[PDB]
C-alpha cells in the first residue's frame, strides 16, 4: 500500500518529532496523531487512540518500525467531506440562509464532539481570517472551505 515516496515523508516527519522530544530514535506515542497530521491525514483523536496513541506525554515511545503500522492503521481513518460538514452546520442554522452566530460556532467547536480548546478555536478562526458581521454572524460555508483547503 505505502509508496516509497510516502515512506520517505514519514521518515522525515518521524525524525523531526523524534528530536523535538529528545533525539533517541523514538517518538512519544502521544504525538502519534500530530506526526500523522503533518503527513496530510486528519484522524480523530479516537482513531489515534485506537492505533495505540496515549493520553499523556511520557507513558510510551515508539521506534520507527512500531510507528509505521500505526500510521498505516490511521491512514484510512474516515475523513469528513464538505457535504457532511454542510449537513452538520445546517442543523444549527436557524433560517437556513448559511449564517450561524459566532457563539454557536464556538459552541460546536468547543462544546461538542472532540472538543477543541479556546486557544485552538481562536487560532483557527484567526488563521482562516473568519470574521463576523455586526450582528455577530458568520458564514459557515466559507469557514468549512478554508479549513478543508488548509494553511496552503
Amino acid at each position: 500500500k505505502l509508496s516509497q515516496d510516502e515512506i520517505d515523508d514519514l521518515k522525515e516527519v518521524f525524525e523531526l518529532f523524534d528530536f523535538w522530544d529528545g533525539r533517541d530514535g523514538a517518538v512519544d506515542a502521544f504525538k502519534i496523531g500530530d506526526v500523522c497530521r503533518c503527513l496530510g491525514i486528519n484522524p480523530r483523536n479516537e482513531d489515534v487512540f485506537a492505533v495505540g496513541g496515549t493520553h499523556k506525554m511520557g507513558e510510551k515511545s515508539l521506534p520507527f518500525e512500531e510507528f509505521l503500522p500505526a500510521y498505516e492503521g490511521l491512514m484510512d481513518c474516515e475523513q469528513g467531506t464538505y457535504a457532511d460538514y454542510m449537513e452538520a452546520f445546517k442543523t444549527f442554522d436557524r433560517e437556513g440562509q448559511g449564517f450561524i452566530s459566532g457563539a454557536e460556532l464556538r459552541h460546536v467547536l468547543s462544546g461538542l464532539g472532540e472538543r477543541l480548546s479556546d486557544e485552538e478555536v481562536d487560532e483557527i478562526i484567526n488563521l482562516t481570517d473568519l470574521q463576523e458581521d455586526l450582528e455577530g454572524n458568520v458564514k459557515y460555508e466559507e469557514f468549512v472551505k478554508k479549513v478543508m483547503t488548509g494553511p496552503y
Binding site: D84, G113, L127, G150
Partner: protein
C-alpha cells in the same frame, strides 16, 4: 434510530474538529523544522563553548577575531 442521527452528527463534528487539528499542525510544521535547526545551532554552539572557554589557544583566537 434517532440515536443514529445524533451519533452521526457527533462523528461529523468530530471529523470537522479533526480537519481543524490537521490544519493547525500542518501550519506549524515549517516553523517546527526551522526551530529544530535553531535549537541544534544553540545546543552545539553552547557545547563547543563549554570546551574551548578555558583553552588558552581559544582565548587568544577570540581576541584576534575582532581585529580580523
Amino acid at each position: 434510530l434517532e440515536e443514529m442521527r445524533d451519533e452521526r452528527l457527533s462523528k461529523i463534528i468530530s471529523m470537522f474538529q479533526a480537519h481543524i487539528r490537521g490544519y493547525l499542525i500542518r501550519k506549524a510544521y515549517k516553523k517546527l523544522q526551522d526551530q529544530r535547526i535553531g535549537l541544534s545551532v544553540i545546543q552545539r554552539n553552547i557545547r563547543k563553548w563549554l570546551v574551548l572557554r578555558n583553552w588558552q589557544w581559544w582565548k587568544l583566537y577570540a581576541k584576534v577575531k575582532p581585529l580580523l
